[PDB]
Amino acid sequence: XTXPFXX
Amino acid sequence: RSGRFGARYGRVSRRRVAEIESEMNEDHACPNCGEDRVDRQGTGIWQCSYCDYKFTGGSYKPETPGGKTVRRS
Amino acid sequence: GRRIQGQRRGRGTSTFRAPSHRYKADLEHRKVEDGDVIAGTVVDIEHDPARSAPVAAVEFEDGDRRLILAPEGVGVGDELQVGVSAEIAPGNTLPLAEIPEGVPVCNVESSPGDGGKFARASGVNAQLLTHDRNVAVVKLPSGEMKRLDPQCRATIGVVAGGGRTDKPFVKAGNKHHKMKARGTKWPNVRGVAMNAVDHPFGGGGRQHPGKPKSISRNAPPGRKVGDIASKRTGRGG
Amino acid sequence: TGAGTPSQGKKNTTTHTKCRRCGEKSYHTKKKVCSSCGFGKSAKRRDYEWQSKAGE
RNA sequence: CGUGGAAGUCUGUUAGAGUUGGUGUCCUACAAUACCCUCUCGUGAUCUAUGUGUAGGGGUGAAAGGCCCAUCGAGUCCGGC
RNA sequence: AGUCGGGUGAGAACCCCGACGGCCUAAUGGAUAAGGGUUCCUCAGCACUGCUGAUCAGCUGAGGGUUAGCCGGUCCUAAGUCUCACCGCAACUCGACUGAGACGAAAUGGGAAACAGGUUAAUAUUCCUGUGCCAUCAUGCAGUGAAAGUUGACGCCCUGGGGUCGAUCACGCCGGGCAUCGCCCGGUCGAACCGUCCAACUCCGUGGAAGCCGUAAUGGCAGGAAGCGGACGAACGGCGGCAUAGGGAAACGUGAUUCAACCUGGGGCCCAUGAAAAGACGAGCAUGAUGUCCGUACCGAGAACCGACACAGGUGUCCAUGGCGGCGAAAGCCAAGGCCUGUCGGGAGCAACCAACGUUAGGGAAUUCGGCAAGUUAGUCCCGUACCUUCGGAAGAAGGGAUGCCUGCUCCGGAACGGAGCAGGUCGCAGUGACUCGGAAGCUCGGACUGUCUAGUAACAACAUAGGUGACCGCAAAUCCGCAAGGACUCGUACGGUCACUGAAUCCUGCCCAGUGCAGGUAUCUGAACACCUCGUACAAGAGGACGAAGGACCUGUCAACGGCGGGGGUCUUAAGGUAGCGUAGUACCUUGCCGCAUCAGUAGCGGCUUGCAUGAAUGGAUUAACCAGAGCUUCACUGUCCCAACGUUGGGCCCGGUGAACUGUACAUUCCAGUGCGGAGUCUGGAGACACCCAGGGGGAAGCAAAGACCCUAUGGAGCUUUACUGCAGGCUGUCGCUGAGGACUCUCACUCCGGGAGGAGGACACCGAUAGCCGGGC
RNA sequence: CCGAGUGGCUUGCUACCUCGAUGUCGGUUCCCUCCAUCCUGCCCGUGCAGAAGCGGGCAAGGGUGAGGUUGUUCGCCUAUU
RNA sequence: AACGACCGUAUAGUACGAGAGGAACUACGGUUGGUGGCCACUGGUGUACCGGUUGUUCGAGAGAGCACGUGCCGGGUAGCC
Ligand SMILES: [Cl-]
Ligand SMILES: [Cl-]
Ligand SMILES: [Cl-]
Ligand SMILES: [Cl-]
Ligand SMILES: [K+]
Ligand SMILES: [Mg+2]
Ligand SMILES: [Mg+2]
Ligand SMILES: [Mg+2]
Ligand SMILES: [Mg+2]
Ligand SMILES: [Mg+2]
Ligand SMILES: [Mg+2]
Ligand SMILES: [Mg+2]
Ligand SMILES: [Mg+2]
Ligand SMILES: [Mg+2]
Ligand SMILES: [Mg+2]
Ligand SMILES: [Mg+2]
Ligand SMILES: [Mg+2]
Ligand SMILES: [Mg+2]
Ligand SMILES: [Mg+2]
Ligand SMILES: [Mg+2]
Ligand SMILES: [Mg+2]
Ligand SMILES: [Mg+2]
Ligand SMILES: [Mg+2]
Ligand SMILES: [Mg+2]
Ligand SMILES: [Mg+2]
Ligand SMILES: [Mg+2]
Ligand SMILES: [Mg+2]
Ligand SMILES: [Mg+2]
Ligand SMILES: [Mg+2]
Ligand SMILES: [Mg+2]
Ligand SMILES: [Mg+2]
Ligand SMILES: [Mg+2]
Ligand SMILES: [Mg+2]
Ligand SMILES: [Mg+2]
Ligand SMILES: [Mg+2]
Ligand SMILES: [Mg+2]
Ligand SMILES: [Mg+2]
Ligand SMILES: [Mg+2]
Ligand SMILES: [Mg+2]
Ligand SMILES: [Mg+2]
Ligand SMILES: [Mg+2]
Ligand SMILES: [Mg+2]
Ligand SMILES: [Mg+2]
Ligand SMILES: [Mg+2]
Ligand SMILES: [Mg+2]
Ligand SMILES: [Mg+2]
Ligand SMILES: [Mg+2]
Ligand SMILES: [Mg+2]
Ligand SMILES: [Mg+2]
Ligand SMILES: [Mg+2]
Ligand SMILES: [Mg+2]
Ligand SMILES: [Mg+2]
Ligand code: NA
Ligand code: NA
Ligand code: NA
Ligand code: NA
Ligand code: NA
Ligand code: NA
Ligand code: NA
Ligand code: NA
Ligand code: NA
Ligand code: NA
Ligand code: NA
Ligand code: NA
Ligand code: NA
Ligand code: NA
Ligand code: NA
Ligand code: NA
Ligand code: NA
Ligand code: NA
Ligand code: NA
Ligand code: NA
Ligand code: NA
Ligand code: NA
């Protein structure tokens, strides 16, 4: 939810 | 004076602290006796280290231009 | 949105209250049936936390010990007087009627007996100008001509501690300490720096008010911010 | 400081205690009011219709 | 020249507080925010215990929509259902 | 962090004894608060629990264990809380004020009084022995004092004096250790209380300084200095008793230095002023009596608390004076005390691979987004130190030299087991020999600074700040909370405090009021309801008129108010038409702009130019010393970052004993190359390959596992937010009606309001309040 | 100029496949391949004297490197080859 | 791919050419990249080992423990490279 999974 | 402020606060600020404090720390003529022995006891409070007279005065001076006016009239 | 800061204020919570429990004395003129025979001796000069100015302790003839809004030049030993016949010297309190015109006065009553209302901050002073069997004209420190009952009592002289505003605070720490002795929330965040939800000026991609700053007097609390009922703004013209 | 496990350590304050009136450990010793029966706030017993389904 | 010992002053893993990099270790963990090294502050707008006040469109907010018991662009519980 | 013996036992790597070896030093020791709640002790056990085992245990079972006039609670009052009364509310278990009462502190606020020894498996200022003290009351004597005053009772920074424990030094005595010397370790005790001594401070007499007295420093004085005499007056300190008490196997010391505790002074700071009450004193003595009630075990943490766990996390106070070391409450090492339970072990020179880490020749940032990671430097003394600068700073700039031991000494000081130096001798590759311990310089950007922030991916240039400016308000105020009763600001009063913007200093901050906003004015125009006039209706609905509040039209003021500062020509839109500056910007599309610096080479960086896609003055412009875990760049130094990898160290990995999960699973399944297929097949088609099972590896594929895609669209879905979207609701302004009274302007006093202790004063039919009407009205 | 084509690296188009997710660009490391061949081998022509070249043919065995700016792929630049 | 490629010498200042300039076959020497192996030599490591030396503890001496898994410093065998 912040780009790369899950950053 | 404003030497305690190191290289902080800029001119005006410390220039004024020094001045005000310079005059504040001067020898002040006691209203009671005449001896130059008045010292600030706190904000607006002054006292003769000689006769012990404790009195109200300026905040940084013992006499304010305004006060000297009262006297007259 | 959410109530703006000015709205949390009214609720009178801790953060917004003055540390009253740390205040010394509700400075108010004494009462005298009449005669004026009252007078006491200055016993000490203290620091008044509520006004960052000195106040004088006094013991009266009828053994009454109370703190007094001290004018300048009042020292220990001095003898003050409070009454219609009180002498016309600095420190004494008497009805404007008995005070000579042109004399600087402080701690003036609005209604006779209220114990003083006007001119009580560091070094300020009112000015008695006109006498009359009816009205006593006093020029308050704001420069306004106030029409008062010549029966309103007032103290002679200017308030002590004058010139306190001449020295800058220099550092946040000095404000901090002073602020802590007043009924005020400090420091101050500008609306423009908040979210839209929190203040009418909040929001945007950059910081700026979303409307003209001058608000109508009739505006509801929650929306009355910025320049309240400004008759004009700026320094020009 | 995590709001999780690390903030659990300071939890050593006593609040809710065996209630003198109802016997439930709901007496807030700092508030002097029972969250269960209402002892300390209400002479009557704390009770609400929403403690059960409307038609019951 | 000396005395004096000021300071939101300096050095400082004193205590204590903080949390920059390693994008290291961990990532069915020791741990639902940890470990190690590195790093910042350390007489002040300082840090901290306990007591106390402010309650949900309301608080609190040096303002990040931050925080209000692992819950926040409107807590939690039950009810409406 | 154990090892060898041994003990107990059916059974022993981990239960116990000894020895050897280690670990912890603000803690891994000692005392405790909260919290836990029996976990404490004893005996008997091993089904459960314990990261393996167990004879062990915080486990199971049964017993036992907590003793107080003088330790806490209890009492007092703090922020503040509750109860009753009063008032509000439709009403209350609701609500602000006021009045009265009560509650509110167990480490850590105030406070009547206890010490020493002995004792138990477990308690202990509680029991026992000895000794002491307080309060109250009773009796007796004294006393008539008795309430004024003092105390309780107080901030921050610096500092002197008194002084105990401790630590160390000297010497004596007692006991131990060592074994070439003569050293090394431990001990050498002894309270509360009673009595007594008193420095500092203050004051008195004497004295009589015109220059002296005094301090670490400030200071002091003819308004009377030194000196002398005296009144008052300190320690948890000295001294005597206590004590042919107690304690010790014994000796059962004496002096000294530095001195925590404790005592007592001096100085400095505040736009900050640093609790209160009970209580004590003031106010004698003897004897006797009484002194109840509640807490008291244990843990207090890498197993007794919170975190689901015997959780590497979190969790307050006191011990800050044990030794060497050194500036040090620092490192390192070592006592006292604690521990081998940060609790599974055995085996392989012990491979690959991984985690931490050491050393790497020559080169030396070539690595890389970037020197990320690592490295370099380092303590102290001497010499010496640029630009710039707000004259403080920059600055430990930079750079250079020194540094040990041994012998004998000098100087400072009362002295230290304190400090500063001299001469001579002498070892090493190396003298801050370990440890501790900065790499340095420059250019540009940003923010002035310290400070604040996204608990859990952002610490920044973001927030704050002083400073600058504007706005509102004379207090029956402005601003704000409440439905009301009422309240914050406010124990406040324009040198105030409310509402906003900008953000140290320095030089400055141009032009525009047209639109929008705010405010002032206003002939005239527009402008609701009540009352009033006409018509209408036996009344009424209803229609129209007159008067006209705020508001609007209109006019003016205002930009450190929202914001604006162009096209065209030698005015046009719409008010003005970009001033100082700055400029290819963290703002410049074109763009790697052009020129220069620098490099072999430089989309970088810096400087100049600059027509600026689309810079610019408190939406602050320019600029700037200092500051910075902030962004970019250059240099010296340094180096395994790299050329290019090697070897080593410890923990795993691998084998063995014991313990023992989870993720995942439509089915089938030894695949590979191609093809086909809903166009990304182990399974279909054609071929190829293919004996089974097992160990280790690094992860190519199973569009691997994990998550009903956040992107995108869609749904007559949701929410937060905005506004000149729709509709409404608070709130403010204004007219009107009621309260409400006497004689389109006016007087009065009697309701009503406010000030006042009262007398009375101000105000006054207004205001407040109830009702209604018009306007404003993303505050909701 | 006009005309005929091959490829499937670029771009564009389409909306077939996956929205109960097939993890991005660039780089890196490590493996296989293609030829439309840059060098190397063998050749043809030359405006081929020689030397140095220019163009073409067969040919994929091997090779095709190091750096400066930029996240860049791309590209620009330096010195080697 | 187990081998790819380049430089140099003799050929030769020759053939060719007015000159300037300037080859080849062949035989040699070496370099580079790649490959496999090996350690006499050089180099690294070498917490085997021996020595110097700082702090501290065992009284001194002697002889040792600890300072992160060698306190630091100096030398270094085999083996592995
Ligand atoms: Cl202020
Ligand atoms: Cl207790
Ligand atoms: Cl002194
Ligand atoms: Cl090269
Ligand atoms: K998809
Ligand atoms: Mg998201
Ligand atoms: Mg007051
Ligand atoms: Mg100001
Ligand atoms: Mg405050
Ligand atoms: Mg601000
Ligand atoms: Mg924000
Ligand atoms: Mg809003
Ligand atoms: Mg701004
Ligand atoms: Mg939370
Ligand atoms: Mg500091
Ligand atoms: Mg520091
Ligand atoms: Mg608190
Ligand atoms: Mg945001
Ligand atoms: Mg047993
Ligand atoms: Mg036990
Ligand atoms: Mg109480
Ligand atoms: Mg206490
Ligand atoms: Mg015990
Ligand atoms: Mg106990
Ligand atoms: Mg454990
Ligand atoms: Mg090297
Ligand atoms: Mg490079
Ligand atoms: Mg490179
Ligand atoms: Mg680094
Ligand atoms: Mg001497
Ligand atoms: Mg730039
Ligand atoms: Mg900053
Ligand atoms: Mg964060
Ligand atoms: Mg930071
Ligand atoms: Mg961070
Ligand atoms: Mg300001
Ligand atoms: Mg201001
Ligand atoms: Mg800012
Ligand atoms: Mg440029
Ligand atoms: Mg301007
Ligand atoms: Mg702005
Ligand atoms: Mg087949
Ligand atoms: Mg979905
Ligand atoms: Mg979206
Ligand atoms: Mg919606
Ligand atoms: Mg009143
Ligand atoms: Mg809305
Ligand atoms: Mg995949
Ligand atoms: Mg071909
Ligand atoms: Mg090939
Ligand atoms: Mg060692
Ligand atoms: Mg070193
Ligand atoms: Na805005
Ligand atoms: Na001086
Ligand atoms: Na950290
Ligand atoms: Na809510
Ligand atoms: Na429900
Ligand atoms: Na004594
Ligand atoms: Na020491
Ligand atoms: Na064990
Ligand atoms: Na600081
Ligand atoms: Na305008
Ligand atoms: Na205008
Ligand atoms: Na502009
Ligand atoms: Na900082
Ligand atoms: Na290395
Ligand atoms: Na795989
Ligand atoms: Na939302
Ligand atoms: Na084609
Ligand atoms: Na395509
Ligand atoms: Na799918
Ligand atoms: Na990639
Ligand atoms: Na080839
Ligand atoms: Na490149």
Side-chain angles (χ1 to χ4, degrees):
Chain A
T2 65
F5 163 92
Chain B
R1 46 166 194 176
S2 296
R4 54 178 149 100
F5 292 157
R8 302 185 286 282
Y9 315 111
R11 283 185 189 171
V12 172
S13 273
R14 38 190 228 280
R15 169 189 175 175
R16 282 184 193 178
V17 180
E19 280 178 38
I20 299 173
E21 302 199 319
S22 181
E23 184 178 316
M24 172 172 74
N25 301 328
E26 302 183 329
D27 281 304
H28 305 286
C30 168
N32 242 28
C33 75
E35 254 51 59
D36 292 322
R37 285 205 185 187
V38 176
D39 307 301
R40 186 185 196 232
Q41 291 309 297
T43 305
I45 305 167
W46 304 82
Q47 185 167 48
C48 181
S49 63
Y50 181 53
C51 69
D52 293 335
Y53 189 52
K54 202 175 180 181
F55 62 109
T56 74
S59 208
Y60 309 115
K61 311 175 188 292
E63 284 197 63
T64 68
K68 303 184 176 184
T69 295
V70 178
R71 294 166 159 176
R72 293 180 172 186
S73 29
Chain C
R2 301 157 79 187
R3 332 264 261 197
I4 64 174
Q5 190 167 300
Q7 287 183 287
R8 277 62 182 289
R9 258 194 62 218
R11 293 186 63 247
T13 54
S14 189
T15 308
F16 304 94
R17 280 180 277 154
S20 315
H21 69 300
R22 246 186 291 156
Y23 285 179
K24 292 183 180 178
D26 182 325
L27 308 187
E28 277 177 354
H29 290 316
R30 263 199 50 138
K31 296 155 192 175
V32 187
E33 333 78 285
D34 204 303
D36 144 67
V37 294
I38 266 304
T41 305
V42 171
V43 177
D44 206 322
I45 299 304
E46 302 174 5
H47 167 71
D48 178 16
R51 320 181 311 90
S52 295
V55 70
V58 176
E59 287 191 47
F60 290 82
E61 287 168 46
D62 55 308
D64 214 306
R65 176 69 176 291
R66 298 149 76 285
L67 290 180
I68 198 175
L69 193 315
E72 177 176 348
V74 173
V76 176
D78 299 45
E79 178 190 301
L80 307 182
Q81 312 191 308
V82 196
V84 194
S85 324
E87 223 183 74
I88 298 183
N92 280 45
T93 301
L94 45 165
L96 286 169
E98 310 298 301
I99 306 288
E101 315 184 321
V103 180
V105 179
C106 63
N107 192 25
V108 185
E109 292 186 302
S110 198
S111 173
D114 62 45
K117 302 292 184 181
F118 314 114
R120 334 209 318 165
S122 295
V124 296
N125 83 73
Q127 196 67 55
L128 186 61
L129 303 171
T130 307
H131 255 63
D132 190 301
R133 309 191 172 185
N134 303 306
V135 67
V137 177
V138 183
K139 186 187 179 189
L140 301 178
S142 72
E144 161 184 353
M145 302 289 255
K146 190 70 181 186
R147 253 161 161 285
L148 290 175
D149 186 304
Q151 214 39 41
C152 288
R153 304 192 274 74
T155 300
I156 293 175
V158 311
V159 193
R164 173 201 57 204
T165 298
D166 303 311
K167 185 180 186 180
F169 283 86
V170 176
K171 58 188 180 175
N174 294 336
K175 242 288 182 50
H176 170 81
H177 292 300
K178 183 196 177 186
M179 238 45 256
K180 187 160 185 173
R182 299 287 186 282
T184 303
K185 169 57 189 171
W186 189 86
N188 310 291
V189 173
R190 302 114 60 209
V192 174
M194 319 197 265
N195 287 323
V197 61
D198 290 309
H199 187 91
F201 292 172
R206 62 211 157 74
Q207 280 175 36
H208 65 127
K211 296 182 176 178
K213 303 192 296 185
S214 304
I215 187 64
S216 165
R217 251 270 143 50
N218 299 315
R223 178 192 168 204
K224 185 182 301 177
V225 296
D227 318 326
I228 303 189
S230 71
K231 304 172 193 71
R232 59 163 285 154
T233 60
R235 326 184 70 186
Chain D
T1 299
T5 307
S7 291
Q8 294 314 106
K10 303 165 181 180
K11 296 186 177 179
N12 71 341
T13 300
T14 274
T15 46
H16 296 289
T17 63
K18 186 85 168 178
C19 173
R20 197 207 303 162
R21 176 206 262 176
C22 76
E24 288 295 291
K25 174 189 140 305
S26 304
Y27 194 62
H28 199 116
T29 195
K30 284 188 176 295
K31 296 183 190 295
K32 302 306 173 192
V33 170
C34 184
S35 69
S36 185
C37 79
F39 178 62
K41 168 200 175 185
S42 170
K44 302 181 186 70
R45 288 271 187 148
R46 172 176 176 283
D47 185 44
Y48 301 87
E49 288 301 341
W50 48 255
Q51 295 178 306
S52 74
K53 291 298 176 170
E56 201 177 59

